[PDB]
Structures are given as structure tokens and as C-alpha cells.
Amino acid sequence: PVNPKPFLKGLVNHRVGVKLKSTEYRGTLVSTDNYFNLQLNEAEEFVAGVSHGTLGEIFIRCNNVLYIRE
Amino acid sequence: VSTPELKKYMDKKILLNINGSRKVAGILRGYDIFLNVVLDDAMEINNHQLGLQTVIRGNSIISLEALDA
Amino acid sequence: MKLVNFLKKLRNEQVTIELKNGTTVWGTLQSVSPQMNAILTDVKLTLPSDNIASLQYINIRGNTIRQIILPDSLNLDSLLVD
Amino acid sequence: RAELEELEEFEFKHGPMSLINDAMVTRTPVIISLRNNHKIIARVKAFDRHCNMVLENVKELWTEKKGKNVINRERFISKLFLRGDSVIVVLKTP
Amino acid sequence: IQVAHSSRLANLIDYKLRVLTQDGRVYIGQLMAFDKHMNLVLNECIEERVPKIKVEKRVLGLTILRGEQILSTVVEDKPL
Amino acid sequence: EHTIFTQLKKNIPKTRYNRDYMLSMANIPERIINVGVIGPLHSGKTSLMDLLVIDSHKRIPDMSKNVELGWKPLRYLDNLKQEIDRGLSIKLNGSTLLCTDLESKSRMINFLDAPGHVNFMDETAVALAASDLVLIVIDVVEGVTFVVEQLIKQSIKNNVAMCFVINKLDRLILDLKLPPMDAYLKLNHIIANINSFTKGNVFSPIDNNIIFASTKLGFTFTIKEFVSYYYAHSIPSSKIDDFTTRLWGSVYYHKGNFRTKPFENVEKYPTFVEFILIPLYKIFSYALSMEKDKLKNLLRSNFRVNLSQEALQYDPQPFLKHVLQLIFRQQTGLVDAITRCYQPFELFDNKTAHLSIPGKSTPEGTLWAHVLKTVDYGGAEWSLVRIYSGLLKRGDTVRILDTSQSESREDDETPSCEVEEIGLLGGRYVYPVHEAHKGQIVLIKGISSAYIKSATLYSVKSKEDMKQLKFFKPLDYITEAVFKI
Amino acid sequence: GDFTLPEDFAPLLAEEEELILPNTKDAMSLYHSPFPFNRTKGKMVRAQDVALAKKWFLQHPDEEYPVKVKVSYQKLLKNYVL
Amino acid sequence: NGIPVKLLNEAQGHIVSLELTTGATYRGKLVESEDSMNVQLRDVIATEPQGAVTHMDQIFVRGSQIKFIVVPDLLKNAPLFK
Amino acid sequence: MVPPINCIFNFLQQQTPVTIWLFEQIGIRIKGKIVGFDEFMNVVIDEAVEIPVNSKGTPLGKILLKGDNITLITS
RNA sequence: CAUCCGGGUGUUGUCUCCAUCCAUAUUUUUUGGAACUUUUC
Ligand SMILES: Nc1nc2c(ncn2[C@@H]2O[C@H](COP(=O)(O)OP(=O)(O)OP(=O)(O)O)[C@@H](O)[C@H]2O)c(=O)[nH]1
Ligand SMILES: [Mg+2]
């Protein structure tokens, strides 16, 4: 029953982490679209599971994304 | 727009040469306009099978060279 | 809305261009396609620590061009009008 | 076409392309991460579907380095167009 | 080397062309036909490659060249 | 005196497609195809091959200024004095030419134009035994009469793909004067009537098995083509395959929408009538009663067609033919609807089986080819042949067996003769060639004395394989001669 | 039902409404005629070269005519054939 | 539509050569081609990027991963271009 | 013929051990159960497990792996 | 076998009447899976 887009929608205003084409991320999701571009707050940059820096307010481009996770 | 004419290769075992210098084998069961492949499962090239049937994405295929003539 | 339009409007500009492979390209933009395919004249290719290679005409593809370094003097707001 | 454009704009206002728009409106200094290891600290001027950008007050950050070596380099550029596939993550430092 | 001051690629059809591709090879030959996606037909095509020294050379012939792999094109000479 | 045939090397017409490039196609066996053209009297066969030819060749010496704008149809493939004065076609005559399909790839085609009189069915049997597919040419007015039935039964009997042409559409409106609807009803009655006798298939304008054409006015089209010239602008590309299948078959069109609904709302005509027959009657009736001025505007503002100042003045008929040929271009709808309606796999094996012993093929260097008929061309005589396997060469000594002998099936088995000359049949001329490849029907000189009626032609490398090859059956002539002198 | 085309899509000549014009009945009458008439263009012919009475004796003699004129039809046909 | 595509289609039957992104040249009879250069080939040799060669029967290749295609020089002559 | 979409649907219906390969990334694989379906190859896959490939096992939660970087499926 | 009443086209001259090609980013092309480091030569 649960498709991806609705899951994504649900997960707005909640913690998420993103891997890339590689470095892990960690932040609260602000909003999403059809193309799967992201906008996050309280972004923390997990360099292979090592929080290098806390950027805060960020916007991730879709094509570099690998997966979403809580 | 046009369908990939792989009706010749239907129900035959094919070497799906796939992205990153890898390979797959298996008998061809189906496909679509994006060239995704649905195939009854076989090994990854010494050798080890995973799965009962397998689905390969379109983008990933380098080649699908026919094992059977 | 469209940056394509803006690009088109930029005509006859002597500009540097930067590629996905880092090649610095000094030339006069005679035209650009709707898909960012740059057409230069009086062109000068240099790498990012080695010698230079000059050419008269270069048609560079849109996918390659990372960053077009714009001219010195430019009214941007005006350009951005439809 | 116009209708489509309007819809797109609305989406941007609502969704994940809102923040960037806001930044543009405000014209604050912002940083961009890029595929080729280039931290682009610059003032945004233009914005579109592809996340291509016209940039003023441009200050890139990278490292020309053939191993083992450690150098940190950065250059000022007045005006600079940017392509969107390059962009990984844009960010706003208050 | 000398060449005219064209507007587009289409207007300079059948000119001898240097061509660069993402892999680093250099295809040289006369542009017979262009594309919506910048694919090129080349009349007498020669792939020229450089191993990591000096120019290695291969004559191909009539070649369809995909635009994905094309980086940029340059004019080698005039017609004929 | 006897025939009318051109003997010089320098007077053969100039074939705008570069003959040399055609002969290269012969190397690719899959590329070349054999189409025969058969149909009852005065269905327009020969004058159709005229359209094809004079489309292909650039300058023909046989055109008078008269027949070029012609009141009188130029009949290129006629070729015999007796067939000129008799007004009929008698001995079958083909041509070979390459033509671009609608996708722009060119393919080499051998037309065999058969006679249409039901006493000459003897020479339609040849056109079946040779050709890979058959165009059955039909008069819209005459409909399908019993002889047409026999043509489709003989076609489907010999395992030969079919395509129908509905010819002589000018005779429909310009004579019978049917209202736009009633014509369409008539087409539904014919096309409905021909499917009845084709058991394993159903033809239909959308499946591209049927080509609407009028030869005397020189236009051939298929709804796919006509859609591709004109309606392809208005609608986005991904719709086209959609739109065409929505053209035929009782669906209507109201505003921007296709609705199979009974005809409700206000205005009612079927789609095929709305987008085709109505603008066609507009083409005729305007091409006659309109003034050259407003018409001259319509043709730019719709069909993207321009008219020279010479063309503005002819007559009703010549100017009509000019306008139609000028709208509907050189006939690519025919070439296509022929091209994709033929599958070599399902058929070729079946026929080669039907014409011989049925067995797995002895493919190889060895040459196996079917000698059909001894045809007379202007110079001397010629033997007509189709190459099923092998490569002929000028000067080979080859075995030639009577088909009357193939019921029999070491030394003593050998008749043999040289191959002195190999031509390609071009109708009014004969084009010399060095060698022939597999699957093209060509002409040999010097076999004539080895047989009567059909004969088989083989040259084998090994003694062992000669036991393993198969021979052709005595060819079937539909009518059996009853009339005795 | 399932799909629609963009409105403004109309048969290519649908702009012009009437497919029958006041003259076209007569045009279709001419398009089948014996000769100087179908063409609608031509060149002058010397006055004595227009045979008005030929078409009458090429046709059958009809019926009610007494033998005297049937003989005349035969005579004239004989001269013509010669 | 693309003229290179057309050319490729025409080359059907002929022995085309064919390198990929990987740099693995093939040479064979072109069986079938599509708008997207989705080539099939018969009786095809296959060179590795390093050097070694391998014979193989009926290769399929997806145009995405194709780099450049060599067609025979007879097709230069006619009759696609004009 | 069995289309890919159909196969995906079937898998979803089942809820079976799916083992995904990554595009242009040999060393890593995913192992879970398909929950979602999209027009593209993208899906959501709850109870996923990242795997380092044999040239063990690693902790991982619920994930949607993006359609562009998929390679293999099996279910 | 000829005569006779006619005819077409071409060139030149002369005469008469007038004038100086889609519109748009999520697998086959252009929104890239690129880069960094190291050996041999
Ligand atoms: N109205 C109309 N008449 C046509 C058309 N095509 C041919 N005819 C007439 O029908 C007669 C037959 O045309 P042809 O093609 O020369 O005859 P045919 O097809 O060779 O008949 P067969 O000798 O038996 O093969 C001709 O005298 C034409 O005048 C046409 O398209 N429309
Ligand atoms: Mg005939």
C-alpha cells in the first residue's frame, strides 16, 4: 500500500539522513518535490559516519542522492 | 518510443554485461521500452547464483550478448 | 524564468569558460543554443599548470560547460527582463 | 506554457526550491558544494528549474595538490554563470 | 590554419573537423550530417589518441559519432 | 515492327537513384524483395507501374509532351506492338529499382507486372511462383468479382504475402458522384467484403494492408502516409501511433476529442470521412470550380504547396493530375505498406518448401535457382530466373533440369550450359550486370535450348551434396487449356 | 473516452465550408466531353478544318430513316475510311 | 529526425564497426538498429580495451553505452543525404 | 512476456527477500523487502540491510533507495 | 512515287504601341558517476 512519494510527504518536518554519489548527512526535512530534491534544517555532515560539520539550513540536489533514512 | 526488438532473444539464456565491469547470466522472460530486463535467475561471473528470478534496470546494461544462438 | 533566454541575450561577449574537465577557454561567444551549446570565436584553450593552445572557432557542447565566466561590465537586472 | 510556468513558480514557492528563491530575494551571501570539490561562496542573481545560477561577488574554494601535498587556494571572480549538474548541496550561513 | 566566421554548426556543413570526446580521443573528418543531439556523421574519419607520449593514429572511414561522448568540435581546414 | 524496345547503352534512362548504388543492395539478401502485381482487367496495374517508374527515372525518351501531362496514360511496361494495338497486357513484364521506404532507408524491389485478362492467368501463375508478395489491384467500381476471389485464393494458396490496392477512385466521384458519406460506406462494403475471403488475416486501412490510389490521376496514399505529411504538425509526436488507429472505424470527432459515441452532439461524420474523403472531395471540386487565385492561396495556407506560373494554366484534367501528384509525393506509402507487410521468416521457408521437396536447406556456395519462363525481349530471347541460393557468374557451366524430369528425383545426369549474359529486366530496356546474388530475379542468355517451360538450375561443388539437393516441381498453371485448334 | 487531442485541431481544409460550388456541377459536366470542349485551351484551326458533319455519320444509322439516307451513311463512311 | 540514425538504419546488413564507452570495439553485420542506437550485430568479433580479441555470435548493444560507429564507405555514395 | 512493472508489483504483493545491487558501486549491496512502487525504478524498502560484498553484515534501518542508482532485483 | 491547300518550334531582322520550427531537468544522448591518489614507461 505505501508508495514512495507519500512516504516522503509524511516524513516532512522529521529527521532524515542522505548518502551521495560519498558522504552521509543528517537533518530535519523541510519539504520535497516530484524530482526528489531536498531542503533540510540542522544539517550535519557525516563524513563516513563522522559528523565533520553542522551547516544548518541546506538544499540537496536530487541527482547526487543515494538513499533516505531515519 | 519504439520497442526494443528482443523477441528473438525471448526464452534464451543471455550474458547481460552490466555496469562496472560486471556480468549476469539467465534465461530471458521479459522487457520494456526502457530496456529493463526480466530474466529467470543465474550467476554473477568463480561463480555463485543469487535469486530465483531477477530484474535488471535499463541504464545498467552495457550489453546483452546471447549465450544460445 | 529561463536562464537560456539570458544566455541567448549575451552576444558577442569575450568570456572565459570552465568545463567539467576543468579546461579554461577564453573566447568571444558568437552564439549559444537553447541547450547551452556554446559557439565561440577568437578562442584560447588553457589547462588548470601547462602551456596554451589557441584556435579560431570552437563549438563546445552544453553538457560540458560547468561555469561560463561572464564579462567585467554587465547590467544583470536589465538582462533578466523578458 | 504560461500556466505551466506559473505552476512551476508556485511549486518552487511551496517546496524545496523555496529557500533558494528566498535567498535570491534577500541577496545574502551563500555557499554551494559542487561535484568537482569546489566550495562556491557567492551572491546569487538568477535561478531556474535546473538550479543553474548567475553569480556575483564570487569566491570559489578548492585545493590544487599533487600528492603528498597540502595547499588551500581560493580566487575572487566578479560575475560568473554556473551549471546545475555541478551543484550537490547549497547552504545559507546566517 | 584559417576559417570563416560562422553563426552555427549547420551552416558550416562538409568542413574538415577536429572533434574531442570525453575519453580523450580526437576524431578528425568532414561533417556530413548533424543532429538534434549533436551526433555527427564524418566522411573520412581518423581517430587520433594520445597514450600516457606521442600521437597514436587510426583511420576509421565513414563514422556515426554519438553526441553524448562529444566534448567540442574545431575546424581543421576548408572544404574539398 | 515486332516490339518497341530501346537498343543502345547511351539511351537507357538515367535513374536518379544511381543504379550502381542499387546493384550493391544485391549483396544483402534480406534487403531486396520481389513484388508481383496482379488483378483483373483494367484495374490499372500497368499504369501503376508507370507511376512508380516515371517517379524513379529522371528523363524518359518515351514521354511525348502529350502523355507527360497526359490525357493518354504512358504505359511503360507494355512493350509489345501487339499489346499496344490490342490495348491489353499480354506477356508479363517487370522492372527492378530501389526506392526509399517512409523511414528513408532504401530497398531494392523487383516488380513483376502480370496481365489481367482471365485467359492469361497462365502468366499470373508465374507472377505468383516468382514474387515474394503480391499486390492485388482492385477497381473500386467493379468491386471484387469472382476472379479477384481466385486471385486471393491463389495468393494464400502459394504462401505469398498480400497487399490490396483500391484503384480508380477518380471514377468514383468524377463519374458516379457519390455523396461524401456514401463513398465511405462503399469502402466499408469492399474492405469488409475482402476480409471475408481472407481467413487467417483481416485487412484494414489502419493496418496498412490497403492502399487508396488512383493511377490515371497518379496519386497513391495510405492513411499512415497522409497523416505523416499533414496531421503530424498539429499534434505532438507521441500521439501519432494513437491518432492513426483512431482514424478508421466508426469513431467520430467533436472538439479536440475522439468519441466513439453514436454520432450524438450535433455534426456527424466518421473520422475517416472527416479527415480524408471530405478534404479529398474538396481537393477535386476546388481544383475544378475554384478560381486559380483563391485556390492558389489555399494550397499554400494548408498543404504547404506552391504553384509555378506555368502550372496555373493547363485544363481541368492535366491541371488536376498535376495538383494531386504535387500534393501526394512520390509513392512512399506503397513502398512502405509493402515493406513491413512482408516477413521472410514465416513465408520464405514455406514457399521454398511448396515449390520443391520439403527439407532443411543445403545452404552453401553451390547455386540453386529456379528458371521460370523463357521471355522474349527485343534482342533475341532470354531466360527468366530467380536465385534461391548461390551466386551466378558470367561464363559458368551449369546443370539445367527440365521440371518434367523432376518426378524422376552418377554420370548421364548432366545437361549443362554456359551463362553468357546476365541482365536486369527494366521493361523498355535491359540493363547489363556482371553477376547476380541470392534472391533477385534476373535474365540469362544462352539457357534457352535446355528445356521447355520451367526448369531448374544448379551447380554443385561435391558429389555427395548433389544427392542431397532438391528440385522444383512442374509449375502449376491455373487454367487448363480447353480451347483446341 | 481515454484521451483527447488539443482543441483547434480540425481537418486541414475544414476552414472552407462548402464542398460543392455553383459551377462545379458544370465543371464535372465538361470533364467528360468529346474534344475542343474538355481542354479549355488550344490553338486556332482553319475554318474548313472543323468537321461538323463527321460525328453524325461515324455513329450508327439509327432506325426510322429510309434506305436513301442509310446509303448515304455508307457512302460517307467509305470516303472517310479511304 | 536524426540523419545519423537514418544512416545507421541504412547500414543494416553491412559490416559495421562499433566501440563503446568501455572501449571494447566490435565489428559485425548490423542486424537491427532503432532511433535510440540500440544495435544488434551478427558474426561479431570483440576486442578488449587492453588488446585481446574474442569471437561471438549475436551481440546486442544499447546506444547509451555506444561511443562511435564505423559504417562502410559505400553508403557515402547514396541516397540518404540527397 | 512478463514486464518489469508487473514483476515489481508481484514482488510487492509477496513481501520477499530482495537483494539490490548499486549502479557504479561494486563493494556495496542492499537486502530487504519491497514496500513501494513508482513510475520510475524508485521504490521504498523497509527493513533494509547494507552488505559489503565478498571480493559480513552491517546495521541499517528502513530506506527508500533511489531509482537511478538501482541495478539488480530478485523476489 | 509526286504535286497542292495548310502547320509547329528555334534564331535573327524589321514594323507598330508604350516607357527612359517545440517549450523545459527523474533509465538511450544536453542536468553527466565526476574526481582524488599511486605504480610502470
Ligand atoms: N478513371 C480511372 N481510369 C483508369 C485509372 N487507371 C487506369 N484507368 C483506365 O483503365 C484502363 C486500364 O488501365 P491500364 O493500367 O493501362 O490497364 P491494365 O492495368 O494494364 O489492364 P491489364 O492490361 O489487364 O493489366 C486504361 O485504359 C485507363 O484509361 C484510374 O486511376 N482512374
Ligand atoms: Mg497491364
Could you tell me what percentage of chain A is helix, strand and coil, using 3-state DSSP and rounding each to the nearest 5?
A: 15, 55, 30
Q: Which of residues 48-67 of H touch strand J (CB under 7 A)?
A: 62-64
Q: Which of residues 2-21 of E touch strand J (CB under 7 A)?
A: none
Three-state secondary-structure class, residue D77: strand
Contact I1 B19 (CB under 8 A): no
Q: How many CB atoms lie within 10 A of CB F202?
A: 13
Please check whether residue B16 is in contact with residue B37, taking contact to mean a CB–CB distance below 8 angstroms: yes
Q: Which residue among F38, F42, F220 has the greatest number of ligand 1 atoms within 8 angstroms of its CB, and so is best to mutate?
A: F42
DSSP string computed for F337-402: HHHTT--HHHHHHHHHHHTB-------SSSEEEEEEEEE--SSS-EEEEEEEES---TT--EEEEE
d(CA F7, CA H51): 58
Q: What is the CATH number of the domain that holds I50?
A: 2.30.30.100
Give strand J nucleotides closer than 7 A to any protein Cβ: 6-8, 22-38, 40-41
- H60 → closest Cβ in B1, B58, B63: B63
d(CA A33, CA A36): 5
Angle of CA points D63, D66, D68, to nearest 5°: 100
Distance F213 CA to ligand 1 centre (A): 12
Which of F433-445 are b and which e, b meaning 16 or more Cβ less than 10 Å from the residue's Cβ? Answer: beebbbbbbbbbb
Task: Please count the residue pairs, one from chain C and one from chain E, whose beta carbons lie less than 8 angstroms apart.
Answer: 42
Distance F111 CA to ligand 2 centre (A): 13
Q: Which residue is nearest to nucleotide J23 (CA to C1')?
A: D1
Residue type, F102: L
d(CA D71, CA D94): 28
User: Chain D contact for A51, CB < 8 A?
Assistant: no
- The cell for F224 is 499512415
Contact F289 G24 (CB under 8 A): yes
Please check whether residue A9 is in contact with residue I50, taking contact to mean a CB–CB distance below 8 angstroms: no
Please check whether residue F298 is in contact with residue F286, taking contact to mean a CB–CB distance below 8 angstroms: yes
CA atoms within 13 A on the CB side of F91: 13
d(CA F203, CA F155): 15
CA atoms within 13 A on the CB side of F325: 19
Range of the domain at I3: 1-75
- The cell for E54 is 606521442
Q: Give the domain ranges of chain E.
A: 1-80
D66 beta carbon to strand J: under 7 Å: yes
d(CA D88, CA D74): 19
CA nearest neighbour of F57 among F21, F103, F99: F99
Beta bridge partners of D59: D41, D76
Q: Which helix (H) or strand (E) holds F333?
A: helix F332-339
Please check whether residue F106 is in contact with residue F95, taking contact to mean a CB–CB distance below 8 angstroms: no
Residue listed under C-alpha cell 509449375: F475
Q: How many CB atoms lie within 10 A of CB F391?
A: 16
Residue type, F321: K
Three-state secondary-structure class, residue I31: strand
Please, is C10 exposed, middle or buried when counting C-beta atoms within 10 Å of its C-beta (0-12, 13-18, 19+)? middle
d(CA B26, CA B37): 10
Angle of CA points B7, B13, B16, to nearest 5°: 90
Range of the domain at F156: 1-222+329-357
Q: Give the domain ranges of chain B.
A: 1-69
d(CA F64, CA G14): 39
CA nearest neighbour of F371 among F322, F426, F417, F321: F417
- Nearest bound ligand to CA F172? 1
CA nearest neighbour of H45 among H66, H18, H72, H63: H18
d(CA F333, CA F339): 10
- The cell for F405 is 524430369
User: Is position F485 within any domain?
Assistant: no
Residue listed under C-alpha cell 543469487: B50
Contact A31 D11 (CB under 8 A): no
Q: Indicate the number of domains in chain A.
A: 1
Range of the domain at D92: 1-94
Beta bridge partners of E73: C59, E19
Contact B63 H38 (CB under 8 A): no
Please check whether residue E23 is in contact with residue E5, taking contact to mean a CB–CB distance below 8 angstroms: no
Beta bridge partners of F438: none
- The cell for F320 is 488536376
User: Chain B contact for H81, CB < 8 A?
Assistant: no
Q: Which helix (H) or strand (E) holds H15?
A: strand H15-20
Cβ neighbours for E74, distance < 8 A, ≥ 6 positions apart: C55, C57, C58, C59, E17, E18, E19, E20
If you take atom 4 of ligand 1, which residue's CA is the nearest one?
F216
If you take atom 27 of ligand 1, which residue's CA is the nearest one?
F42
d(CA F37, CA A67): 63
Ligand 1 nearest-atom number relative to CA F41: 24
CA nearest neighbour of B58 among E67, I23, E37: I23
Range of the domain at H21: 1-82
Which of H44-74 are b and which e, b meaning 16 or more Cβ less than 10 Å from the residue's Cβ? Answer: bebbeeeeeeeebebbbbbbbbbbbbbbbee
Please check whether residue H40 is in contact with residue H32, taking contact to mean a CB–CB distance below 8 angstroms: yes
Q: Indicate the number of domains in chain I.
A: 1
Method: cryo-EM
DSSP state of H73: G
Q: Which of residues 234-263 of F touch strand J (CB under 7 A)?
A: 236
CA nearest neighbour of B63 among H46, F3, I58, E77: H46
CA nearest neighbour of F36 among F168, F158, F152, F124: F124
Q: Indicate the number of domains in chain F.
A: 3
Beta bridge partners of B23: B17
| Residues F143-148: contacts with CB under 8 Å, at least 24 apart | F143/F189, F143/F190, F143/F193, F144/F190, F144/F193, F144/F194, F144/F197, F145/F40, F147/F40, F147/F118, F148/F39, F148/F40, F148/F194
- The cell for F92 is 508479363
Three-state secondary-structure class, residue H22: coil
D37 beta carbon to strand J: under 7 Å: yes
Q: Give the β-pairing of D29-34 and B37-40.
A: unpaired
- The cell for C12 is 558577442
Please check whether residue E71 is in contact with residue E22, taking contact to mean a CB–CB distance below 8 angstroms: yes
CA nearest neighbour of F433 among F382, F442, F385: F442
d(CA D88, CA A20): 9
| CA distances from residue F93 to D18, F45, F53 in whole angstroms, order as listed | 75, 11, 13
Q: Give the β-pairing of F133-139 and F33-38.
A: parallel
Q: Determine H/B contact with 3+ CB pairs under 8 A as the test.
A: yes
Beta bridge partners of F417: F398
User: Chain H contact for B9, CB < 8 A?
Assistant: yes
All domains of chain C, ordered by start, with CATH? 1-82 (2.30.30.100)
B65 beta carbon to strand J: under 7 Å: no
d(CA C65, CA C33): 12
DSSP string computed for F92-147: -EEEEEEEE-TTS-EEEEEEEE---STT-HHHHHHHHHH-SEEEEEEETTTB--HH
Please check whether residue C10 is in contact with residue C29, taking contact to mean a CB–CB distance below 8 angstroms: yes
DSSP state of F274: I
d(CA F348, CA F346): 6
C8 beta carbon to strand J: under 7 Å: no
Cβ neighbours for F238, distance < 8 A, ≥ 6 positions apart: B1
d(CA E36, CA F282): 37
DSSP state of F173: I
Q: Determine A/I contact with 3+ CB pairs under 8 A as the test.
A: yes
Contact B10 I1 (CB under 8 A): yes
Q: Give the β-pairing of F106-113 and F33-38.
A: parallel
Residue listed under C-alpha cell 508465374: F126
| Residues F340-348: contacts with CB under 8 Å, at least 24 apart | F340/F208, F341/F133, F341/F161, F341/F162, F341/F163, F341/F208, F341/F209, F342/F33, F342/F132, F342/F133, F342/F161, F343/F161, F344/F30, F344/F132, F347/F132, F347/F159, F347/F160, F347/F161, F348/F132
Give H-chain residues touching F18 at CB under 8 angstroms. 77-79
Could you tell me if residue H13 is left (phi over 0), alpha (psi between -120 and 50 degrees) or otherwise beta? Answer: left
Could you tell me what percentage of chain G is helix, strand and coil, using 3-state DSSP and rounding each to the nearest 5?
A: 40, 0, 55
| Crossing angle of the two packed helices D2-14 and D18-26, in degrees rounded to 10 | 90
Write phi, then psi, for I13 (nearest 5 degrees): -60, -45
Alpha-carbon torsion angle D26, D31, D33, D37, nearest 10? 150
d(CA E71, CA C65): 9
CB-ligand 1 contact for F254 (6 Å cutoff): no
Q: Indicate the number of domains in chain D.
A: 1
Please check whether residue F85 is in contact with residue F61, taking contact to mean a CB–CB distance below 8 angstroms: no
Q: Determine D/A contact with 3+ CB pairs under 8 A as the test.
A: yes
Contact B32 I3 (CB under 8 A): yes
DSSP string computed for D44-55: E----TT--EEE
DSSP state of D29: E
Domain B1-69 belongs in CATH node 2.30.30.100: yes
As annotated, the binding site of F includes 39-46, 113-117, 167-170
| Residues G16-24: contacts with CB under 8 Å, at least 24 apart | G16/F282, G16/F286, G16/F298, G19/F180, G19/F278, G19/F281, G19/F282, G19/F285, G20/F285, G21/F285, G21/F286, G21/F289, G21/F290, G22/F289, G23/F289, G24/F285, G24/F288, G24/F289
First to last CA, chain E: 15
- The cell for F148 is 479477384
Q: How many CB atoms lie within 10 A of CB D11?
A: 16
Chain C neighbours, 3+ Cβ pairs < 8 A = D, E
Where is chain A discontinuous (C–N over 2.5 Å), named by the preceding residue?
Answer: 21
CB-ligand 1 contact for F116 (6 Å cutoff): yes
